[PDB]
């Protein structure tokens, strides 16, 4: 089977640098794991690398002495094309329903695995998008229920960075869709930036905004430094939960039978981590 990923930054503006830095970094992790560009669909408003406010033009970093994570990232859905309608079409593998953007979609097969990562603002039962309208959790779950009805994936893992992010799935994500999801925070709780001015470890002084989000960099920095053939989703969740409590409470939803699976089945494996 093929590994697919959909990476979504739900916000825009330089003050939200971190959500797009998280998504660019996630792309780098998946590329090191051997996922192909044709199978990684990126949604990012794309106003950060060339931002009038960026002190390192053309570069995005997601930790204080990190490498540039912007170089190489596909521009599938950027600017006004970062929409709920396009995200739905993409997840459902329906290029005819896409309006604007590259036309890349998750035209996946029953044997394929899918990883979804979202980073931005959240509210009760709702996720931000940088264009109107926002993404209502019930509508996202309805897209996932439809994808399941279509039969076009084997298992799916969703990592979700937002305030009140548990509220995206609590009470509404069924446990029998072969979808396991974790979230940065509880249903009525805030989630946090990391690498922020004024709290060590802090970013370089040219940055007046956080470089990343704690739950997001927790899984990414863990993934790029461990052999993912040997680490399970359960071990990753435990490590991410521990790092994020610092904090907020990382929650899990859906098919908990997926937890003992090795992470490389979703994120790939980097030979350098042996």
Kindly list the structural domains of the chain, giving each domain's residue range(s) and its CATH number in brackets, ordered by start. Answer: 1-274 (3.40.50.1460)
Q: How far apart are CA 111 and CA 121, in angstroms?
A: 33
Active-site choice (19, 24, 25, 163) = 163
Nearest to 14 by CA among 75, 69, 57: 57
Written as six digits, the tokens of 123 are 């509210």
- At 103, phi and psi to the nearest 5? 80, 0
Q: How far apart are CA 139 and CA 142, in angstroms?
A: 5
Written as six digits, the tokens of 14 are 């330089």
**Catalytic (active site) residue 121:** yes
Q: How far apart are CA 68 and CA 86, in angstroms?
A: 27
- Give the DSSP H or E segment for 119: strand 113-119
Nearest to 126 by CA among 117, 139, 116, 115: 139
Active-site choice (19, 24, 121, 210) = 121
Q: How far is CA 9 from CA 79, 119, 181, in A?
A: 11, 5, 17
The count of residues in the chain is 274
> Residues near 253 by Cβ (< 8 Å), separated by ≥ 6?
166, 169, 170, 173, 175, 180, 181, 182, 183
**Separation of CA 33 from chain center:** 15
Q: Are the beta carbons of 108 and 2 closer than 8 angstroms?
A: yes
Nearest to 187 by CA among 167, 162, 215: 167
Written as six digits, the tokens of 165 are 């992010």
Strand order in the sheet with 113-119: 40-43, 3-9, 113-119, 155-161, 179-183, 251-254
């Amino acid at each position: 089977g093929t590994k697919w990923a959909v990476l979504v930054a739900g916000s825009k503006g330089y003050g939200n640098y971190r959500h797009q830095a998280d998504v660019c970094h996630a792309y780098q992790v998946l590329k090191k794991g051997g996922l192909k560009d044709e199978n990684i669909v990126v949604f990012m408003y794309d106003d950060i690398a060339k931002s009038e406010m960026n002190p390192r033009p053309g570069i995005i970093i997601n930790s204080p002495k990190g490498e540039d994570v912007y170089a190489g990232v596909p521009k599938d859905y950027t600017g006004k094309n970062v929409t709920v309608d396009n995200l739905s079409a993409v997840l459902l593998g329906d290029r005819s329903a896409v309006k604007g953007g590259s036309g890349k979609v998750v035209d996946s097969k029953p044997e394929d695995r899918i990883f979804l990562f979202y980073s931005n603002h959240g509210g009760p039962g709702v996720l931000g998008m940088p264009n109107e309208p926002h993404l209502v959790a019930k509508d996202l779950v309805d897209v996932l229920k439809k994808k399941h009805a279509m039969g076009t994936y084997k298992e799916m893992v969703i990592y979700l960075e937002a305030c009140e992010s548990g509220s995206i799935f609590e009470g509404i994500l069924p446990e029998d869709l072969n979808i396991y999801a974790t979230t940065a925070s509880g249903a009525q709780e805030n989630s946090y930036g990391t690498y922020c001015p004024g709290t060590e470890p802090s970013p370089p002084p040219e940055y007046i905004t956080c470089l990343g989000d704690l739950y997001s960099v927790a899984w990414m920095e863990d993934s790029e430094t461990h052999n993912l053939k040997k680490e399970s989703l359960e071990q990753q969740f435990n490590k991410v939960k521990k790092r994020t409590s610092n904090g907020s409470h990382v929650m899990e939803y859906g098919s908990k039978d997926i937890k003992p699976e090795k992470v490389y089945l979703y994120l790939g494996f980097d030979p350098a981590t042996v």
